[PDB]
Amino acid sequence: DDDDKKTNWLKRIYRVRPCVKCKVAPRDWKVKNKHLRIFNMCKTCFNNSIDIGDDTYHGHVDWLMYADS
Amino acid sequence: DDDDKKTNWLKRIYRVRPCVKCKVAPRDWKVKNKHLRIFNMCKTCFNNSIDIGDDTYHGHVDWLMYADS
Numbered sequence: 001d002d003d004d005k006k007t008n009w010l011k012r013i014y015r016v017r018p019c020v021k022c023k024v025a026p027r028d029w030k031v032k033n034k035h036l037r038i039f040n041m042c043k044t045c046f047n048n049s050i051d052i053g054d055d056t057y058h059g060h061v062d063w064l065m066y067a068d069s
Numbered sequence: 070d071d072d073d074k075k076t077n078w079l080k081r082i083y084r085v086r087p088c089v090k091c092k093v094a095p096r097d098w099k100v101k102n103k104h105l106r107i108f109n110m111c112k113t114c115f116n117n118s119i120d121i122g123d124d125t126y127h128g129h130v131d132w133l134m135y136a137d138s
């Protein structure tokens with residue numbers, strides 16, 4: 001089934017690349033109806049980044065949650 | 070840069086999982102303006118599958134080519 005290829009990929013993608021900043025915590029994310037948005041940083045490092053005034057790691061990557069457009 | 074996260078993922082995804090059928094050849098694919106469609110099989114195994122009358126591996130997974138929707 002093709003949706004499971006997509007899901008297992010998104011599963012893996014999420015697991016194998018942690019927060020770009022603290023490098024252990026998994027990333028923050030959310031659902032945009034159609035897509036899964038994986039934020040670069042976990043939530044703690046994100047808020048922290050704002051307190052320290054560093055926006056280098058701010059951003060996200062959206063993934064279509066289905067196999068078909 | 071967030072588009073490069075997407076591109077390098079799509080790069081990897083394409084490289085590490087070959088034709089579901091012959092298991093060595095890389096998959097057939099094409100661009101759908103917005104998305105990259107990775108077909109399950111290379112083109113040779115695909116046409117062959119039709120000649121032998123087996124549609125088990127027919128299908129594709131679409132990937133948004135950008136980091137942002």
Ligand SMILES: Nc1ncnc2c1ncn2[C@@H]1O[C@H](COP(=O)(O)OP(=O)(O)OP(=O)(O)O)[C@@H](O)[C@H]1O
Nearest residue numbers: 027028029039040041042043046047057058059060
């Ligand atoms: N945990 C996080 N790690 C890295 N970057 C983040 C994180 N959370 C938010 N950002 C970035 O901060 C900016 C604002 O985030 P957010 O997604 O809240 O946008 P917004 O203006 O609130 O609109 P929306 O509510 O639709 O997202 C975007 O660049 C987002 O990618």
Ligand SMILES: Nc1ncnc2c1ncn2[C@@H]1O[C@H](COP(=O)(O)OP(=O)(O)OP(=O)(O)O)[C@@H](O)[C@H]1O
Nearest residue numbers: 096097098108109110111112115116126127128129
């Ligand atoms: N190389 C391939 N490996 C596995 N499945 C394939 C391959 N090529 C096509 N298919 C599948 O065969 C069906 C038809 O393919 P195709 O993408 O040509 O659809 P279509 O009806 O031609 O419309 P479009 O031209 O928009 O794709 C779809 O299920 C497609 O996923």
Ligand SMILES: [Cl-]
Nearest residue numbers: 063064132133
């Ligand atoms: Cl995607």
Ligand SMILES: [Zn+2]
Nearest residue numbers: 019022042045
């Ligand atoms: Zn972190």
Ligand SMILES: [Zn+2]
Nearest residue numbers: 088091111114
């Ligand atoms: Zn093949």
